[PDB]
């Protein structure tokens, strides 16, 4: 056994990405062992839909995707099919049907710092809801008043992004969390992703 899929890159990165402009990673043509995943023993959530949360090594898949984002611990309930909320409508959505797993673990000792961490942001509002697996990074000032904004935010001229306020002194909610979503697929082409022998 020589070639193996790079799961440590997704699970163990120096810093993740904001929820609005999130990451998607395509994994194919490698050997995937899922026993390494338990390095983060205190797994806060391990919801798996349409697949057995243990016999992942059984099947061979054409490719697998890995979506990772950082949200507030009070909102990890919106990562599920048929869910509504601030994030499900404007930042990230799951399809009405799903397959794979969702993995979440607290990262209060790596993201929250004294003086407030202002590197993770999210989108307040938009005209229409996000699609499943649709990403939007456009940041234009919405003009509600009669007078134009001309690229300056003020009264009746709203910027659509706000930054999470992360500090070590917070509750169980309002603390940073890290999410990974694994989507297993197989379609026509020969399957090149499954466990070692």
């Amino acid at each position, epitope marked *: 056994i020589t070639n193996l899929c790079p799961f440590d890159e997704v699970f163990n990165a120096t810093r993740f990405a904001s929820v609005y402009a999130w990451n998607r990673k395509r994994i194919s043509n490698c050997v995937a062992d899922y026993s390494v995943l338990y390095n983060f023993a205190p797994f806060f959530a391990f919801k798996c839909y349409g697949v057995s949360p243990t016999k992942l090594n059984d099947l061979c898949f054409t490719n697998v995707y890995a979506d990772s984002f950082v949200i507030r611990g009070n909102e990890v309930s919106q990562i599920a099919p048929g869910q509504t909320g*601030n994030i499900a409508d404007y930042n990230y959505k799951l399809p009405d049907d799903f397959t794979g797993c969702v993995i979440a673990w607290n990262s209060n000792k790596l993201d929250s710092k004294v003086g407030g961490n202002y590197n993770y942001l999210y989108r*307040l*509002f938009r*005209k229409s809801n996000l699609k499943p697996f649709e990403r939007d990074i456009s940041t234009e000032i919405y003009q509600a*008043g*009669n007078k134009p904004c001309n690229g300056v935010a003020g009264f009746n001229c*709203y910027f659509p992004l706000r930054s999470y*306020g992360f500090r070590p002194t917070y*509750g169980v909610g309002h603390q940073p969390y890290r999410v990974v979503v694994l989507s297993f697929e197989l379609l026509h082409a020969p399957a090149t992703v499954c466990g070692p022998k």
Partner: antibody
Amino acid sequence: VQLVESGGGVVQPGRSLRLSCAASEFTFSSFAMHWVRQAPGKGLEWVALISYDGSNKYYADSVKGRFTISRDNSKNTLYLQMNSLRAEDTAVYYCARVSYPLTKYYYGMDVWGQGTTVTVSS
Amino acid sequence: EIVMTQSPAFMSATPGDKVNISCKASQDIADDMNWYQQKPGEAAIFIIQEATTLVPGISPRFSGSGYGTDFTLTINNIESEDAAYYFCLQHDNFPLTFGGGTKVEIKR
């Protein structure tokens, strides 16, 4: 930016009335609105909430089943209909606007109105 | 239903000095509150947002602080036209509840 309330007055107990709130110099169709009231000698009390599209409506428990909230985007108007009025409805009614546009999960007001007075007496 | 308590109900203000107004909550609400000022006969004014952020266009004398359940509004370098009705509102969960009341009067 301005908000004007009108339609208040004296009414006998058990009857009905309608108040209208008019907005101007801003896009009325992209904001959620609040109806609030303040009884004489008492602190303010939240009454009702309506969303920018009109599907979501929220009412206080003490005014459930009697008050109806609605809006007209074309005429830029907000309507509150009151039925079966009783002795505790005498107060001053305020029309307020939610701070952020095109949002359904904020519930924060920034712009108020002058207010109208409703008296329930016979 | 979160009961929101404001203190003191009445006070007397010297032409100078600083004044602190306390708003307390029966549950944890984080920074989910606003501070409003209303002069008699006019509409209310949006003064403080999220208990820490000063609204643009207001004098920098006003300030706010507090996280959790206890919050404080501070007015420094009082003037004559600072006499109004101050109230604290929370918008965390339904139903929305306001504070109590506070009237500030200039002392002579």
